[PDB]
Design a protein around this ligand. Structure first.
Ligand SMILES: CCN(CC)C(=O)C[C@H](NC(=O)CCc1ccccc1)C(=O)N[C@@H](COC)C(=O)NCc1cccc2ccccc12
Ligand SMILES: CCN(CC)C(=O)C[C@H](NC(=O)CCc1ccccc1)C(=O)N[C@@H](COC)C(=O)NCc1cccc2ccccc12
Ligand SMILES: CCN(CC)C(=O)C[C@H](NC(=O)CCc1ccccc1)C(=O)N[C@@H](COC)C(=O)NCc1cccc2ccccc12
Ligand SMILES: CCN(CC)C(=O)C[C@H](NC(=O)CCc1ccccc1)C(=O)N[C@@H](COC)C(=O)NCc1cccc2ccccc12
Lengths: 216, 223, 222, 217, 222, 221, 223, 217
């Protein structure tokens, strides 16, 4: 019993430790997702619901399964009741339940680390919420930033020294890539939960726009 | 049966008659048809008694169930949608004669304007719903008499007391023209039930108040 | 009920009346029968209110569901097939009386000609669909009156504004000959709802402009 | 057999010992729940039914599973008969059964400890009831206070020395935070709620933010 | 076939006739239709005998089952809800002719005022129930006659004895106007069954007492 | 599979031995159940049927599962035939079958010991019956008393030398609490006992509890 | 078909005719409709032959099954409940035409008074049952005639033999007014079957006794 | 558990290592598939959808199972929505998911390596996409070429030095067979096919026999 759980925890931990890193930061305009991602079409950051976004680190097929399960959950709940009854705390909670079940009962535990972020609805004043869900279903309520995957200690320390609340988009982006390098456009995946969009807050920042932001 | 609901500045009021019938025979005189289903919503149901009470009871359990599970109550839209789903679920049995339609009255704490936060939602047997922006609505066999009375009396509604009197008077007109709707029984002291809902929540109106309004209406019709 | 949709150079327009009935009785005056279902499509539905609203809501959720799952929206053909599959899904209940037919209007961003990118698709109770090539279409109990009006008025459509006027006027004729279709209520200030879709997406037409067009038509027929 | 149950028991007990602590004690106004909890939205204290409240220590997703299951049990039984037939004894009993099944049959035993509390219905005189259910389904009927999670002996001893029946809300809160501090505490590190025997219907209310800050000074 | 129940200060009484029929033919003279289902509740059932007796037996077993499982009896509200759910469960068979309606009479040990702690609950075929606040109620083919008799006689109920007398006399009027309800058979010595319930519980009324009340009523009518 | 059954039997036996003790003895008025129990609302003794009572030692949730199952069995059989057809022998037999299956096939055996008791129906003259069902489904028909849980030898001997088949309820209670004290030292008060009786002089349901001031009156004078 | 059963001091007797019909056509003259189902109960069934015989056979198997499983026979109440549940089980097929009603006669060994320990239980198609306190009962197409005869002849029942002759005479009147019920055939020597039950158990009445009683009745009706 | 998984990885890796090689590279006319294959009728390269092709290395029955599953998926999706909604990214993603489930849950992991390729629809201008899915569900997006099976490093380096964007069919075929040889091949030992972006409907076509021979020369 102690052996099997030691081995599952060790396999998941080692798998996540060997993956590329991802940061999520609260800034003045909402939440910023910045991920080391060389790919052209395979995504680690995604929209879950109107004001709820998703970021993941680790084995792709696994956190993509979880990503699809989260979208299914969000759309189903919004249909069953209402779109505003869907919250980031709900999705984080279900991810905790699910990753607990996976960790204990699936053939191999998922080598993933998840972040669910929520910004305010258009025209409301609410501090963004960041949630971290680890491979065993442990869940953490974070106020400033989340770091996942790879060697997380240098990045966490870099942000601790370099994070200021309500930073501008360019500043938060630059401090984020700085923390990660502890990296151009065709090696980063960047997206934002923009609290100033009327409905769907998720929007990607790609290509020329992203480079125009990085050069400042 | 007649259930009325009307908006007033800052809240909503719902009232229902007390008569239970089987065909022409009166089988109940003190029946309750309006239920506080939520801190901020009341539901009144017309039709088969068993189905109506099961609707109100099951609905209240559902709302409080979500609230305890997720730590926050449903948005008013969510409440509407769940009630609609419940009715549509009963559609088949309704075709078999176990028909019950609800009328929903609530106070939306998340609304922008706290004075127009009152909400009135009507439903059909297929679960289709309409949020009434003309201020009043009724359901039951006397609903059209009550609605047409409120059409003329609604201009007098400026607060909880005026809206409550207009509601009770609409129930009076309903019972006046519909034998399935019971009027005020001054011999037994049985009067319509009413719920009022504002920012401080949903409260039952004491029966003596409804009695006072009933006597006011009666003497108003006598001289 | 009457829903109209017509193509204009560079986009499409869809408008619908506001009347809800139970038999001869009027049970609604402000209802919305035209819904923006995605950034480039609107759906207007006639029939049983519960089934119609369920169609629009479930449909929009389905399109956005695919878009978030796969990172790209459905092709317009796929959107058509999904809506059709939904109608055919309701066929059994429709036979029992819960019948609702949708009319689809969209702007195909993947279309070759950005001026002919407008799309209008009509549906029957079995999910069979037709993409309307003659530019306009209607659905509901007044749809024959609205279509025959647009047959005569379509030559006046040269831009978004003229197309919106032709839409509102067709709804006016429908309400004129069909008691289930609501005309402009000048006492209460309730007018048809309209959505316009061009290359920049689908936007709700402001009530004021529809009110002005309605008053112009009424003043022209007096 | 011997090996497996020894190992499961040790995994659960170690899991609970590594977790934050929770205290629930009966006071003059009902039952007081105070838990070490830094989170802003993740809850260890919950309403179960009208006069029945829930508190848990250990792995969040697991005692949250048990919490939702308890809410389903309570709501279902209250629907099946009446709201008044739902008792804290029932929820404690079904939690005992459930944790027995989980402990013996699940892939990994639950690293949780539960407390179910019941106060009297409005206007009725009945002493509060506290129930402690441990990871293997063991159930205990405790008269004054329940401590769960972390190093329980120092907190239990602190309460054993400082608890008086029928303290006011401020006194009970003080005794509680003091007992918690004797092991490894302001507003944004506590979660506080009460089963208030003086509320007419739903006795569960949370004490958060400015109000809690005022009750701590 | 006729079951009556009325509240008196400090308790409730329920009585029922003894006649079993198949159409117009009399198939039973000694039948029992009122059953003590719990220490503080009695149930009288009208309709198909098989369904009625099965209702009483299954119901009593259900109450004591809950009581032994949970160590405490159900609240009176719970008892009402369980009987209603049982009736609703039989609705389908009832539509096919296996119809049975119950009348519930109880003493609520948790009531605030013990003098009015009596409870009388009536049911319809769909499980809808009503707690009777006017003090009396009846069920069965003679229930209208019994109800109107109690309407005139209820002012005489001041204790268990007068309430039992009014109950027996209401069953007498029922049998007087309904051929399906059996009156007192003085030749065979068969009289209605009665249960009385107060703070000390539910006890069967001895037949001798019902008999003397019957003779009092009979010569009261000559 | 020698050691699987060895370890299961030892786990259950040790589990019962670490639990508190329970006594059931026949007296002039029926059957007396006395159990060491600190709880006020958590019960080790229960009614099964009209004249049949239940007592258990060991792990609570497990013997509560068995208790609920027995109540279910009894009520179902009484419905299927008649209340008079439900007997203590029947319930003990079903408990033997059930605990046998649990012992051999469940993930962990039940750490329980059960006693099923039956007194005569009202007005009938027959001796009480006591049945002991152990963790592996072994069933024993015992004539005077049953002791379950903890160290049973001292309690059994204490009951053995001063047992009266025809003691009064108070006398049998004193003998029982004396026997329990000899197993653990000087005071077993009300707040540590759960007492109930199958009273053969009750008309229908023989099971009644003796609680609080009444039980105190039975413990002092 | 006619089955009779009556109580006498110290026991019960049940007798049934021997005729099997298909409409007006006689398809059997020697059929047996009364079965000893256990040491203290006999069952006579009227209706569809297939269903009646299966009732008797399955019921006997069920009783002896319980007795062997539990080492003790069922209480008489339990026996009644099992027979009733069996009938209700056949209700649907009865509605389709496979209808059979049983009449149960027993001796309750656990009864207080051994002289009135006889039991007679009638059943309807839904499994509803009645224990007949007035001492006699009949079932089948001639049951009305037999019952009305026993109503007049029952005062002559003072022991088992007088009760037996009253049973046979009631079957005689049944066959006299109902063509589906067979009377005594003196040419073929076929007479009703009878079972008698007392504390010593249930035994078949020998045919010679029934034939003597039949001939006595016939002579009494001729002069 | 942790031993079982690395053992599975070792079985799959060894199996793929002992298998013949396959290359897919983007050229001016679309995508080119070249595979070591002596068989006359057993195929390692196949059409998936209108513009989507499939190539595999390792155990035949296993990657043929995966091939059939991919066809099932693509055809079902095109029917459920539209043919143009089927993309190579979708097939690569579902293959990653599937090989993950197989790797962790089947009795023996699949000793396979997969390539999903997509060319533009007729008349559109979009650079081809190549996807590599390995036995454990790992998914990789490759811009120029994919090499699978056997000893890959010589093939990858050979293609790295000899690959030009927009080579003709003959040049790309030459450089490809040169690279595989670097890991004497001809018509009766090769299986060759192309996703030809100039076909209006179905882009997959095979190059066999005399045609292939001409190209080889
Ligand atoms: C025995 C006392 N009782 C139960 C409470 C009744 O008499 C109610 C009455 N049953 C019926 O009419 C029986 C329906 C039925 C028919 C056939 C098979 C199965 C069921 C009723 O619902 N009547 C309807 C007439 O239709 C509209 C009614 O009065 N409806 C009004 C009503 C609305 C909301 C809550 C209510 C609660 C109690 C009583 C009435 C209530
Ligand atoms: C409670 C108030 N309400 C719901 C809003 C209604 O009265 C609507 C009305 N229900 C009905 O007519 C009930 C149909 C029914 C029949 C049998 C069993 C169960 C149900 C309706 O759909 N009428 C149709 C008649 O079509 C000729 C209609 O007006 N349809 C128009 C319509 C189209 C799109 C969206 C709509 C949204 C809301 C209301 C209407 C809408
Ligand atoms: C064979 C002896 N017996 C059973 C006791 C009867 O003859 C009763 C009679 N059966 C029937 O009428 C048979 C019903 C039926 C018909 C066709 C297919 C399936 C079922 C009855 O229920 N009559 C009804 C008439 O309904 C109004 C009745 O009297 N009901 C009154 C009644 C109420 C509570 C407990 C009772 C217990 C025994 C007898 C009657 C009881
Ligand atoms: C082939 C010889 N035979 C079998 C013994 C018969 O002819 C019996 C006869 N079948 C039928 O009448 C067949 C009915 C049927 C028609 C269509 C589909 C399914 C069934 C019968 O039951 N007749 C009934 C008439 O109903 C009133 C009858 O006589 N019933 C009396 C009777 C009662 C108990 C046990 C019996 C055993 C054997 C024979 C008769 C018995």
């Amino acid at each position: 019993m102690e052996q099997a759980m030691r081995e599952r925890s060790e396999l998941a931990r080692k798998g996540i430790a060997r993956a590329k890193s991802v940061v999520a930061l609260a800034y003045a305009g909402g939440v910023l997702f910045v991920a080391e991602n060389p790919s052209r079409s395979l995504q680690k950051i995604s929209e879950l619901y109107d004001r709820v976004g998703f970021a993941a680190a680790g084995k792709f097929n696994e956190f993509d399964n979880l990503r699809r399960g989260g979208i299914q959950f969000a759309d189903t709940r919004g249909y069953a009741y209402d779109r505003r009854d869907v919250t980031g705390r709900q999705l984080a909670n279900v991810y905790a339940q699910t990753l607990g079940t996976i960790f204990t009962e699936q053939a191999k535990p998922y080598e993933v680390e998840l972040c669910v972020a929520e910004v305010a609805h258009y025209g409301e004043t609410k501090r963004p919420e960041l949630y971290r869900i680890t491979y065993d279903g442990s869940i953490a309520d974070e106020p400033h930033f989340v770091v996942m995957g790879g060697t997380t200690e240098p990045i966490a320390n870099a942000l601790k020294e370099s994070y200021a609340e309500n930073a501008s988009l360019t500043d938060a982006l630059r401090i984020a890539v700085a923390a990660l390098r502890a990296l151009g456009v065709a090696s980063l995946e960047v997206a934002v939960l923009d609290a100033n969009r009327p409905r769907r807050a998720f929007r990607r920042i790609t290509g020329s726009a992203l480079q125009a932001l990085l050069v400042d | 049966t007649t259930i009325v609901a009307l908006k007033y500045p800052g809240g909503v009021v719902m009232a229902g008659d007390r008569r239970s019938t089987q065909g022409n025979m009166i089988s109940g005189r003190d029946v309750r048809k309006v239920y506080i289903t939520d801190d901020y919503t009341a539901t009144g149901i017309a039709g088969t008694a068993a189905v109506a009470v099961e609707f109100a009871r099951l609905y209240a359990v559902e709302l409080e169930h979500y609230e305890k599970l997720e730590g926050v109550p449903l948005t008013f839209a969510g409440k509407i949608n769940r009630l609609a789903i419940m009715v549509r679920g009963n559609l088949a049995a309704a075709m078999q004669g176990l028909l019950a339609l609800p009328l929903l009255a609530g106070y939306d704490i998340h609304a922008s304007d706290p004075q127009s936060a009152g909400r009135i939602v009507s439903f059909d047997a297929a679960g289709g719903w309409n949020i009434e922006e003309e201020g009043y609505q009724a359901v039951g066999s006397g609903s059209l008499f009550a609605k047409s009375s409120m059409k003329k009396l609604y201009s007098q509604v400026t607060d909880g007391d005026s809206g409550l009197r207009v509601a009770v008077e609409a129930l009076y007109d309903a019972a006046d023209d519909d034998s399935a709707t019971g009027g005020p029984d001054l011999v037994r002291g049985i009067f319509p039930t009413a719920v009022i809902i504002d920012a401080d929540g949903a409260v039952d109106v004491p029966e003596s108040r409804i009695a006072e309004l009933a006597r006011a209406i009666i003497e108003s019709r006598s001289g």
